[PDB]
Design a protein around this ligand. Structure first.
Ligand SMILES: *C[C@@H](COC(=O)CCCCCCCCCCCCCCC)OC(=O)CCCCCCCCCCCCCCC
Lengths: 151, 726, 35
């Protein structure tokens, strides 16, 4: 009833070739974004390239925070909530600079009797949050292309 | 308008003559009446008389009599009043002098207030105030600090730091009243070691403990990253002695160290270390580096090397558990993780993950182990515009060496082995589609998407009851975690899998291709029971196969200021909703927000996943049912109220409440805070224990660029701090 | 009398993996209070 398979691509046709730029090129978010763009068939160029007509994706400040979300009746922590916030910009070669952002929420229960096990669980959670934040940024690329046509 | 620019418009902005004089030399003016000019050898002198007005770009000087020297640039204004131009500050002295190429502004029996004209909230009268522009300091002799017309204290040499350059000296103290320590007073001294390091020493005096606690902070900035150390030491405690008379020494202390940095883009260094003298340290003493809500102290070091397609890490993980019901705690000393990635091996992507860890326990009766893991992986990704399918295969090969098993094997029916091998493959298939439709009955230009997803996972069954569980904990199943390929963390319990996950997400985009709404539902269907060989979870139902796990998520961005979030988990083996949470926020800016939230965790979920004494202990057994409210709003553009209230609907008692008020003028700021929190459990009367705290802070303004309203510091200062969910 | 402020080297960011547990949001700026 009106539905049809997605005829257009995920990443805009303009951003088929991009420059991925970062201050921590070997970090966990750069690896997540670079792999996500590779799935979408995007050809990534080096920052120091001869090309002067390709958009540049810049990865900025990444914050991870773990806070107490609820407590037991003795005041001890019951649940921890983790928030990951990512800031980025997409520079079109000739137009302005378009900022984008991501925010991921996760939570889990705390167990002082298996604190080592809960440490490994938290490390696993952060890796997943990096995959989600990489997807959220890529879903914002069509919004940048639309703003480009308006201006 | 904001405070910073509201306090700006208040401040100013850029041969006898015998007549109305307006002599100007580039920038400096002199609107005197009678000017007497001399050129005696040349030693050029200017003798002004009558309503002298030395206007400038830096100061405005007014005085009945003036004088100047055109060679050494020495001025003299008698019985005058000055005022800074382009900055905040004004006063009145019996003699104003500019000396040393207009470096020193020396005042004899002068005063100085950074308050706006017509306001005299505070002043500091001295006798030899000197403003030095190279050092950005204002030295005062025989200083008397005055509030209104009433002095409050006297002391020689009351330097006032002008500007934003850092200096070493005493900071303004602050006070508290808590029910644990009674009246408290902090007197900080700041030491400015170097541009990239500094230290701070704070004698914290607590009335009830009857001694001074010494707080020492050290911040540094290096090539390897930025860090912070904290070392607190209370030589003796009077409250602690009564509760623990048998202990010979009642010292309390805390060591904290946090480091994080990346050097040369390839070396990553991390430290997260906490150590305290006793379990009850944070229930008594309020720190920025620990909370009374903690259950243990984490002590981790990590050194790693990362490149484009390879990374290795060596780390140690140790924990200090506080509760007296726990005495055994495992540690990784050390752990080595290695990853290697290689793509485009034909149409496949390959990957290797290896590990080597050594487990040690605080107790001397517990098993001790060494484990080596290898995990090669290969996948074949396929995709197009409207769909993608990803097929993956994996091998999980582990080896164990378990020693010190005599004490455990004596009192348990099933025995641990000394040498264990565990090899098991894993096969997974993951699919995805996307549909779209033009949703015009909502608004023109909108679209809606429908994204169904499916996954199939198969792992065979290995009996893992001869392996002790060191680092495996049950993982939550939210909607994001429905498609996870693991049931436990770590590598000690690897459950079997023969299951299909199905889910669907719908999104609503507007004409700007900006997402407005998304909602998700999913389930996991089991064809065979998931067993690790050591299965002792306490399920309410004897269900093994079928559709057992359900989950959902939502997010609606109603406007630029409104937001709604939700999530629910249902488990059929619990016969009830496992967990749930909800949240709605309105947020105009940092100083205007309202938030409502709810958190739920069933009594059966506590029984299934947490320790066995949780389901019988009164402070644990009922799960979670918590309603919270957070607000922040200004009144009359200077006041700022922050409040928080968290309520437990199961016990009909609060968990936390907070209230803070701050008044921030153009030359001072005052903040008062209150918080009542849960702070322990009384085992005799079987009721919770609360703590009350009132804090009073004061501050001077107008000397540096600081004009904060203190909202974010107040919103983050309780046990359940504020998180921005918009 | 002293002023406390941010550190700098004597004359974007790193993507971490360790979260900040219960950060108290004590801003780093020129101040005469401890924070
Ligand atoms: C170097 C100073 C840092 O502070 C300054 O910059 C100098 C100005 C001092 C700021 C005082 C603000 C607090 C007092 C305001 C009035 C109370 C509140 C009013 C109602 C809400 O070092 C400091 O840290 C400041 C000095 C320490 C605090 C002073 C408290 C009183 C001292 C009395 C001892 C004097 C005894 C001899 C004279 C009787």
């Amino acid at each position: 009833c009106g539905w049809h398979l997605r005829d257009t691509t995920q990443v805009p046709s303009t951003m088929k070739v991009m420059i991925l730029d970062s201050g921590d090129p070997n970090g966990p978010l750069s690896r997540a974004v670079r792999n996500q763009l590779r799935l979408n068939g995007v050809e990534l160029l080096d920052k120091e390239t001869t090309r002067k007509d390709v958009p540049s994706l810049r990865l900025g400040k990444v914050s991870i925070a773990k806070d107490t979300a609820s407590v037991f009746r003795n005041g001890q922590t019951a649940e921890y909530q983790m928030i990951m916030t990512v800031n980025a910009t997409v520079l079109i070669p000739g137009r302005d600079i378009y900022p984008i952002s991501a925010k991921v929420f996760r939570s889990f229960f705390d167990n002082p009797q298996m604190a080592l096990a809960k440490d490994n669980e938290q490390d696993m959670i952060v890796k997943e949050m990096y995959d989600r934040a990489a997807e959220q940024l890529i879903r914002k690329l069509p919004s940048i292309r639309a703003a480009d046509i308006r201006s | 308008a904001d405070l910073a620019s509201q306090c700006m418009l208040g401040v100013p902005s850029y041969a006898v003559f015998t007549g109305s004089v307006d002599i100007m030399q580039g920038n400096s003016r002199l609107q005197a009446d009678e000017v007497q000019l001399h050129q005696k050898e040349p030693v050029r002198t200017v003798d002004a008389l009558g309503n002298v007005h030395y206007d400038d770009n830096q100061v405005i000087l007014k005085g009945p009599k003036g004088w100047a020297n055109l060679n050494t640039k020495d001025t003299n204004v008698w019985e005058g009043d000055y005022q800074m131009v382009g900055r905040q500050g004004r006063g009145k002295a019996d003699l104003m002098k500019q000396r040393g190429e207009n470096r020193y502004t020396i005042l004899d029996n002068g005063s100085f207030t950074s308050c706006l004209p017509g306001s005299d909230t505070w002043s500091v009268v001295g006798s030899e105030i000197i403003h030095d522009r190279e050092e950005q300091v204002a030295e005062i002799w025989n200083a008397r600090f005055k509030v209104g017309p009433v002095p409050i204290f006297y002391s020689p040499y009351l330097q006032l730091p002008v500007g934003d350059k850092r200096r070493s000296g005493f900071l303004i103290p602050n006070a508290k009243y808590t029910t644990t320590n009674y009246f408290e007073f902090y007197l900080p001294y700041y030491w400015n070691i170097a541009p990239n390091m500094d230290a701070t020493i704070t004698p914290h005096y607590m009335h009830r403990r009857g001694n001074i606690m010494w707080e020492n902070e050290f911040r540094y900035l290096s090539q390897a990253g930025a860090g912070l150390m904290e070392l607190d030491y209370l030589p003796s405690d009077k409250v602690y002695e009564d509760e623990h008379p048998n202990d010979d020494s009642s010292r309390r202390w805390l060591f904290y160290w946090n480091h994080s940095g990346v050097m040369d883009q390839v070396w990553r260094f991390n430290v997260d270390y906490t150590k305290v003298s006793d379990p009850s340290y944070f229930n008594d003493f309020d720190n920025k580096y620990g909370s009374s809500t903690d259950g243990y102290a984490t002590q981790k070091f990590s050194v790693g090397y990362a490149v484009q397609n390879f990374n290795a890490t060596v780390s140690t993980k140790q924990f200090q558990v506080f509760s007296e019901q726990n005495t055994s705690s495992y540690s990784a000393e050390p752990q080595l993780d290695v990853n290697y990635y290689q793509n485009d091996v034909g149409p496949f992507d390959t990957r290797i993950y290896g590990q080597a860890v050594h487990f040690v326990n605080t107790r001397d009766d517990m098993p001790e182990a060494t484990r080596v893991h290898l995990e090669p992986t290969i996948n074949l990704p396929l995709s197009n515009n409207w769909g993608s399918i990803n097929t993956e295969a994996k091998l999980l090969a582990t080896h164990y060496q378990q020693t010190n098993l005599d004490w455990y094997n004596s009192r348990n029916t099933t025995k641990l082995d000394e040498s264990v091998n565990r090899v098991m493959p894993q096969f997974k298939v993951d699919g995805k589609m996307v549909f779209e439709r033009d949703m015009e009955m909502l608004a023109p230009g909108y679209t809606q998407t429908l994204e169904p997803r499916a996954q199939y996972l198969y792992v065979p069954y290995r009996d893992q009851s001869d392996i002790y569980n060191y680092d495996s904990s049950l993982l939550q199943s939210d909607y994001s975690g429905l498609f996870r390929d693991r049931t436990y963390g770590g590598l000690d319990r690897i459950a079997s899998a023969n299951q299909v996950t199905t889910g669907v997400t719908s999104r609503i985009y507007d004409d700007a291709a900006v997402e407005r709404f998304n909602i998700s539902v999913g389930q996991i269907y089991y064809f065979t029971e998931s067993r690790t060989g050591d299965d002792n979870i306490t399920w309410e139902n004897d269900d093994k196969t079928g559709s057992l796990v359900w989950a959902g998520d939502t997010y609606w961005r109603i406007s630029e200021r409104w937001g709604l979030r939700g999530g629910i988990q249902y488990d059929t083996r619990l016969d009830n909703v496992a967990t749930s949470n909800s949240s709605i926020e309105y947020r105009r800016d940092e100083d205007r927000l309202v938030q409502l939230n709810y958190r739920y965790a069933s009594p059966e979920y506590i029984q299934a996943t947490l320790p066995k004494y949780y389901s019988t202990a009164e402070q644990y057994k009922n799960g979670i049912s918590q309603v919270g409210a957070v607000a922040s709003w200004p009144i009359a553009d200077r006041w700022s109220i922050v409040g928080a209230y968290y309520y437990d609907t199961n016990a009909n008692k609060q968990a936390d409440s907070m209230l803070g008020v701050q008044y921030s003028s153009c030359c001072y700021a005052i903040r008062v805070g209150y918080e009542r929190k849960l702070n322990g459990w009384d085992n005799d009367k079987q009721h919770a224990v609360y703590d009350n705290a009132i804090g009073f802070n004061i501050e001077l303004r107008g000397l540096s660029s600081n004009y904060g309203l203190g909202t974010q510091e107040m919103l983050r200062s309780n046990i359940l701090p504020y998180q921005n969910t918009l | 009398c002293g002023l406390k402020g941010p550190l700098y080297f004597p004359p974007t960011q790193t993507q971490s993996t360790v979260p900040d547990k219960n950060d108290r949001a004590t801003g780093d700026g020129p101040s005469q209070v401890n924070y």
